[PDB]
Amino acid sequence: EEEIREAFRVFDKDGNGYISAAELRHVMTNLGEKLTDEEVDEMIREADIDGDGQVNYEEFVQMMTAK
């Protein structure tokens, strides 16, 4: 799990908590996860993303660990 958090951090130059959704979909595709683009889109629609610009990757990390 920490590895998922550090990759997300690799995508957070300011080590704070928010990165752009494209960056998030990208961190998730590099970690070697075999989650499909549609499932990602379904996880994105239930997450608040396009309509605000930046997402807190911590909630997406928590959901992937639970699953």
**Domains of the chain: residue spans and CATH:** 1-67 (1.10.238.10)
Dihedral angle, C-alpha 14, 28, 50, 36, nearest 10 °: 180
Paired tokens of 21: 């959704």
Paired tokens of 64: 């992937």
Q: Is 41 within any annotated ligand binding site?
A: no
* Alpha helices, H only, the chain: 2-10, 21-30, 37-46, 57-66
Experimental method: NMR
Q: Is 62 within any annotated ligand binding site?
A: no
Distance separating alpha carbons of residues 11 and 24, to the nearest angstrom: 8
Nearest to 24 by CA among 66, 64, 67: 64
- Packing angle of the helix pair 57-66, 21-30 (nearest 10 deg): 40
Helix (H, G, I), strand (E, B) or coil at 14: coil
Dihedral angle, C-alpha 26, 27, 30, 34, nearest 10 °: -90
Q: Is 52 within any annotated ligand binding site?
A: yes
